[PDB]
Each structure stands twice: as C-alpha cells, then as structure tokens.
Design a protein around this ligand. Structure first.
Ligand code: CA
Ligand code: CL
Ligand code: CL
Ligand code: NA
Ligand code: NA
Length: 446
C-alpha cells in the first residue's frame, strides 16, 4: 500500500479456462522481483498449499532489477510444472499516475511477448500493479483505453487483468468506467481486479457492495490482493473469502513472504519453503473457505447433543452446494428436523457442511453425527488452534435409505479448547454424477 506517512477467455462475469470450464482463482501473491533466488522454493511451496494460481511480481526495471525474458520463461515453467495458473504483473508503476510508467509496463509485455504468446491457457497478464494511485476513474480509464490496444496489436492474446485505481482500493473506478475499458479490448478478453484492504474491504458491507458493483457491470472480477489488516485499519478477510465463494469471485492473498517491517504481518509463511505457515497463512490455506476447502486446479492441468436443528440451521454453512443448507422435516435421526443441502455430484467431487464457530470441546473425547444422501462416502472433521489444524475420521460409505453414524475420536486431538470449525466432508464416488441432497443431524459429543 501507500506510505503510512486457445486459452483463457471471459464471458460476462465468468473467467473460463481453455476447456470451457469456469475458473475461480484461489491463490497467493509471490514477491519474486525482490527475491529472485527464491523462485523455485516459493512456487513449489505455494503449490503445496493447494493454491490453483500464483500472482508473480515482476519488475520492468523502473524501480528494481528488470526481470529478463529467460527469467519470465523460467517463472512460467515453474508455475506450469506445478499445475499453477500464473498471473504475471509489472510492479514498478505502483501508485503512479504517470502515463510514462504505464507505457513502460506495456513496452515490457511487448518485449517479452515471445514468452507469453502460446501460453494463453496458463498465463494471465495483469498489466500493472496498482497503476494510477489517485482516485480518478476517468483518468484511469484513459490510460488503459490506449494501453490495451497496443498490447493486442503486438500479438498478445492472453486474458488481461486490470487493477482498479486508488492503489487498487477504488472499485468505483471499475463500476463507472470498467465497461469502457473492456470495450477498448478488441478481443473482449479483459477482467478486473480489486485490492481489498482497509478502504475497499474494511467491513462486510463494503466487501459485498464493492464486489457487486463490479459484477453488475457484467465484468469478471478477482480480488487480486487482500490481507487480514492493513496500514490504517482492519480488513474483513472472512467476508472476502465467504462472499467470493458464494459469487464465484477469485482471490489472491498477499503475500507469501518478504514484506517489509511495516507490513510483515502480511507474510503467509515464516519460511520460503512453506513448511511453517503464519496464522495469516493458515487462515488462507486451512481456514473456512480457504484453499484446502475451495481451491480447484485449472482443468487444463487435470453425551450431549450440540446440533439437533429443530428450530434453525444453527449457524451452519457449507461449500460446493447448489442450494441450501436448510432445516427440514423431510428426514431426521433425532427429533423431527435435520440439516439439508442440495449438491451436484461429479467424479470424486467433495462437498461441505460446517459450522464455523469458536468453542471448547476440552474434556470431550468423541464427536459423532448421523448423515445420509437422497454412491457417496463421508467423514466428520474438526479444526483447532490458530493453525486451523485438521482432524477427521476415515471416509465411510453412506447411503440414501437410512442414516449412517460418523464418528471422530478426540482423545488425540490437540488444542481442543480452541475448536474453530466442525463439519462433514462428503465425497462422491468415481462414477458418481447427477443431483442429490445431503443431510446431517444429531451432532453429539461425549
Ligand atoms: Ca434433529
Ligand atoms: Cl452480477
Ligand atoms: Cl452469484
Ligand atoms: Na499492494
Ligand atoms: Na481482519
């Protein structure tokens, strides 16, 4: 932020991969330009988190050491070899209003075109990180209206990504002029990015409205950068992650490692290898709506009852659901109600029903729940600690005629006093397809 003192294509609000399958970015930003020797270690580390995309910081020589074409080719290779989509971006014009800085970035992409042309199915070009620091939508648009044509004229066919003005925190620029910028692309293959920090994502209302204001212009969107907090305030990362999942919006967390003292709290990993994630890193990778739960690789590469649901859904949510969850009387194992959700099955597809809530299950030694579907397998799980550490039983077969009781032994679970989430992971079989419903009832601990 500013000082404290045949390939990808866009269709409406959806970004599609080369196979015609929607692609929802779930990834991490890596500050390559400042730490060039960490390329292999960092990208492999990021791949291990389950991320499906890595945004790579490049320098065109304006402020740091220019990344030459061999470096660009190597970075793309590392991403590809690890099944990661690469969003490349030039960082030297960050916060600048000058057309000169933007033109230098454009000249850079043109110079490196031989490493980008032919990589349309795996590489997306983010023209310039946070170009135009002022909050002026018209001036911002004028810059890109001249830049986009230049890029296309040079032969670049990659999907282009455009950062909003105001250091990325002025999404109104996209709502007001995004369509004009998009129409400046003869290939109509441009998407937009918001950097949600303390101004653009300060609270739940801002996160939702800012995302809606870009999408309602029928433009594809990604939260290119976001954190759990920033220079002048808190950032609602929880809503960014939950709402982005609801609306199919991509996101990329900032950043793997290497932030300066003023922003060191934004490092996702303590080590370059990624063997020791920070709390922020665990929120992104292992937390609710995180990488482990929602990231899908581009297809180009591939005794007390806690919940009875008798009066409400009791705070439960889920992911990879078509509709729901709802509390219904259609089926139940205890009382007259159960939690129900609809899902679309696909080969080995995974679906979730979970209650995100801090609580203590200390003293408890077991947790179980009864589930069923309208083949499938399922397992009960819990997450504990600041690291959202996962603990689950083994996947067991469930059926559609009656309920199957799932169980998890808590005797060996650490930090039970710090439970963060409780849920059931449903997994379709290899030859499973079609619509069905999943249910859960009588969640009890002893
Ligand atoms: Ca019940
Ligand atoms: Cl919309
Ligand atoms: Cl939606
Ligand atoms: Na930034
Ligand atoms: Na926060």
């Amino acid at each position: 932020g500013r000082p404290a003192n045949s390939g990808f294509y866009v269709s409406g609000t959806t970004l599609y991969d080369a196979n015609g399958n929607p692609f929802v970015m779930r990834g991490i930003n890596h500050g390559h330009a400042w730490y060039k020797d960490q390329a292999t270690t960092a990208i492999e580390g990021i791949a291990n988190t389950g991320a499906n995309t890595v945004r790579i910081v490049l320098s065109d020589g304006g402020q740091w050491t220019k990344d030459d074409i061999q470096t660009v080719r190597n970075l793309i290779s590392l991403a590809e070899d690890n099944n990661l989509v690469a969003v490349l971006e030039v960082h030297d014009a960050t916060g600048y209003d000058s057309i000169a800085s933007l033109n230098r970035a454009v000249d850079y992409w043109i110079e490196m075109r031989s490493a980008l042309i032919g990589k349309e199915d795996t590489v997306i070009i983010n023209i310039a990180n946070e170009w135009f620091g002022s909050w002026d939508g018209a001036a911002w648009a004028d810059g890109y209206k001249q830049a986009i044509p230049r890029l296309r004229n040079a032969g670049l066919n990659n999907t282009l990504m455009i950062d909003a003005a105001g250091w990325g925190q002025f999404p109104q620029s996209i709502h007001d002029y995004g369509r004009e910028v998009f129409n400046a692309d003869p290939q109509r293959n441009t998407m937009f990015s918001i950097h949600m920090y303390e101004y653009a994502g300060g609270n739940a209302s801002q996160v939702r409205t800012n995302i809606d204001r870009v999408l309602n212009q029928d433009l594809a969107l990604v939260i290119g950068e976001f954190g759990h907090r920033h220079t002048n305030g808190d950032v609602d990362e929880s809503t960014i992650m939950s709402y982005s999942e609801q609306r199919g919006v991509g996101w990329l967390a900032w950043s793997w490692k290497g932030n300066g003292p003023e922003w060191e709290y934004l490092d996702l990993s303590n080590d370059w290898a990624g063997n020791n994630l920070t709390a922020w890193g665990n929120t992104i990778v292992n937390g609710p709506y995180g990488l482990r739960e929602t990231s899908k690789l581009s297809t180009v590469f591939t005794p007390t009852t806690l919940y009875d649901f008798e009066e409400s859904t009791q705070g439960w949510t889920g992911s990879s659901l078509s509709r729901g969850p709802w509390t219904v009387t259609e089926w139940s194992s205890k009382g007259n109600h159960s939690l129900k959700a609809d899902i679309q099955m696909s080969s080995n597809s995974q679906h979730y029903l979970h209650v995100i809530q801090n609580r203590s299950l200390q003293q408890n030694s077991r947790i179980q729940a009864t589930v069923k579907h309208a083949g499938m397998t399922a397992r009960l799980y819990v997450k504990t600690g600041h690291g959202y550490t996962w603990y689950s039983g083994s996947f067991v077969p469930i059926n559609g005629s009656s309920g199957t009781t799932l169980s998890l032994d808590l005797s060996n679970v650490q930090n039970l006093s710090q439970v963060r989430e409780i849920g059931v992971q449903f997994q379709s079989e290899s030859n499973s397809s079609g619509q069905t419903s999943i249910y859960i009832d009588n969640v009890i601990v002893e």
